[PDB]
Design an enzyme around this catalytic site. Structure first.
Site, PDB file in Angstrom:
ATOM      1  N   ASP A   1      19.544  64.754  31.419  1.00  0.00           N
ATOM      2  CA  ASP A   1      18.081  64.607  31.426  1.00  0.00           C
ATOM      3  C   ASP A   1      17.500  64.946  30.030  1.00  0.00           C
ATOM      4  O   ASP A   1      16.517  65.672  29.881  1.00  0.00           O
ATOM      5  CB  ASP A   1      17.444  65.455  32.548  1.00  0.00           C
ATOM      6  CG  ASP A   1      16.011  65.045  32.854  1.00  0.00           C
ATOM      7  OD1 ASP A   1      15.618  63.880  32.604  1.00  0.00           O
ATOM      8  OD2 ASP A   1      15.265  65.911  33.346  1.00  0.00           O
TER       9      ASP A   1
ATOM     10  N   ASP B   1      16.625  72.426  30.266  1.00  0.00           N
ATOM     11  CA  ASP B   1      16.402  71.691  31.522  1.00  0.00           C
ATOM     12  C   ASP B   1      17.540  70.747  31.933  1.00  0.00           C
ATOM     13  O   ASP B   1      17.318  69.597  32.336  1.00  0.00           O
ATOM     14  CB  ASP B   1      15.075  70.929  31.434  1.00  0.00           C
ATOM     15  CG  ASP B   1      14.261  71.047  32.697  1.00  0.00           C
ATOM     16  OD1 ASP B   1      14.842  70.814  33.781  1.00  0.00           O
ATOM     17  OD2 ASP B   1      13.055  71.389  32.597  1.00  0.00           O
TER      18      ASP B   1
ATOM     19  N   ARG C   1      10.561  66.056  26.061  1.00  0.00           N
ATOM     20  CA  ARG C   1       9.881  66.977  26.982  1.00  0.00           C
ATOM     21  C   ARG C   1      10.785  68.112  27.487  1.00  0.00           C
ATOM     22  O   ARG C   1      10.276  69.124  27.965  1.00  0.00           O
ATOM     23  CB  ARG C   1       9.305  66.226  28.197  1.00  0.00           C
ATOM     24  CG  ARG C   1      10.371  65.767  29.184  1.00  0.00           C
ATOM     25  CD  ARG C   1       9.865  64.942  30.364  1.00  0.00           C
ATOM     26  NE  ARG C   1      11.007  64.300  31.049  1.00  0.00           N
ATOM     27  CZ  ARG C   1      11.508  63.085  30.772  1.00  0.00           C
ATOM     28  NH1 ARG C   1      10.973  62.308  29.818  1.00  0.00           N
ATOM     29  NH2 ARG C   1      12.570  62.631  31.455  1.00  0.00           N
ATOM     30  N   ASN C   2      12.104  67.907  27.427  1.00  0.00           N
ATOM     31  CA  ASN C   2      13.095  68.911  27.803  1.00  0.00           C
ATOM     32  C   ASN C   2      13.770  69.590  26.603  1.00  0.00           C
ATOM     33  O   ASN C   2      14.815  70.214  26.756  1.00  0.00           O
ATOM     34  CB  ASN C   2      14.129  68.279  28.753  1.00  0.00           C
ATOM     35  CG  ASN C   2      13.503  67.794  30.066  1.00  0.00           C
ATOM     36  OD1 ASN C   2      12.545  68.376  30.571  1.00  0.00           O
ATOM     37  ND2 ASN C   2      14.051  66.724  30.621  1.00  0.00           N
TER      38      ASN C   2
END
Ligand SMILES: [Cl-]
Ligand SMILES: [Cl-]
Ligand SMILES: [Cl-]
Ligand SMILES: [Cl-]
Ligand SMILES: [Cl-]
Length: 271
Positions: free
Chosen positions: A152, A170, A156-157
């Site tokens: 993932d 994450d 954003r992570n």
């Protein structure tokens, strides 16, 4: 055995007493769960500001095991998992909590967007955008060396630490490699694909990938050989590096160790 013993040790190490932690305000909330600010009482008697992410006995055990593994990671470009707590709800549902360092600068995606606003961080120079990419490559290189798949990876992570170092955290159709869209198979080279998309998020200062293309159209779009377009003011050499991440055949894509050195070299060359 050693494998079993190693896991037992990691399990001991990962759990935090619920009474060493106090929970504060909600900073974010969704279908997946919550993020709250918190305080962790440390071994030295002082408290540390933390972020607390809240989400069958097997599902609990799986969480615990996964967390045990993640805490064991030790690299400056990989988020440090401080530990976990399992609090039980009034209806008897388990509430697993992930304790992490509080990072005032937040996720990299939001940061990039703020940098295009007057109150936010100043215009990020090319050299810093590239350094973000090197940092992420360094974290992904580490994970890859221990055959851990991220699954993932996206801006954003990735998190910004207080010294502006980026770490992966994450562990989303437009980040997913062509083969994983097709055969639902996912390797380290699929993470490399995601990394190329992430590099493009950074170079565009937070654009959503593939403007003009909808999520349901993605597989066919890629199937006819279309890829992310070169961002404006993105170095040709940087674009070649990110384009190499989206080679049709996983085996032609570079490893993270190779990408990382390419990116470091490029950064070195800038004045
Ligand atoms: Cl509390
Ligand atoms: Cl960290
Ligand atoms: Cl930090
Ligand atoms: Cl945008
Ligand atoms: Cl595009």
């Amino acid at each position: 055995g050693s494998h079993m013993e190693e896991l037992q040790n990691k399990l001991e190490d990962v759990v935090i007493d619920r009474n060493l932690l106090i929970l504060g305000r909600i900073l974010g909330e969704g279908e997946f769960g919550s993020v709250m600010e918190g305080n962790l009482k440390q071994e030295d008697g002082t408290s540390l500001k933390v972020a607390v992410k809240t989400m069958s006995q097997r599902e609990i055990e799986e969480f615990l095991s996964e967390a045990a593994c993640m805490k064991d990671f030790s690299h400056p470009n990989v988020i440090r998992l401080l530990g976990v707590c399992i609090e039980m709800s009034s209806q008897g549902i388990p509430k697993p909590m992930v304790i992490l360092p509080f990072m005032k600068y937040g996720d990299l995606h939001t940061y990039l967007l703020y940098s295009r606003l007057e109150t936010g961080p100043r215009h990020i120079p090319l050299q810093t955008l590239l350094r973000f990419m090197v940092d992420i490559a360094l974290g992904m290189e580490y994970l890859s060396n221990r055959n851990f798949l991220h699954r993932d990876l996206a801006a954003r992570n990735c998190m910004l630490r207080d010294d502006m170092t980026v770490c992966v955290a994450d562990f989303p159709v437009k980040w997913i490699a062509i083969e994983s869209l097709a055969d639902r198979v996912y390797t380290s080279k699929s993470d490399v694909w995601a990394f190329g998309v992430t590099m493009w998020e950074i170079a565009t200062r937070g654009m959503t990938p593939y403007p003009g293309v909808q999520n349901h159209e993605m597989y066919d779009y890629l199937l006819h050989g279309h890829r992310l377009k070169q961002p404006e003011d993105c170095l040709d050499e940087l674009y070649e590096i990110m384009y190499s991440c989206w080679r049709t055949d996983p085996l032609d894509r570079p490893t993270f160790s190779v990408l990382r050195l390419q990116l470091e070299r490029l950064l070195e060359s800038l004045p």
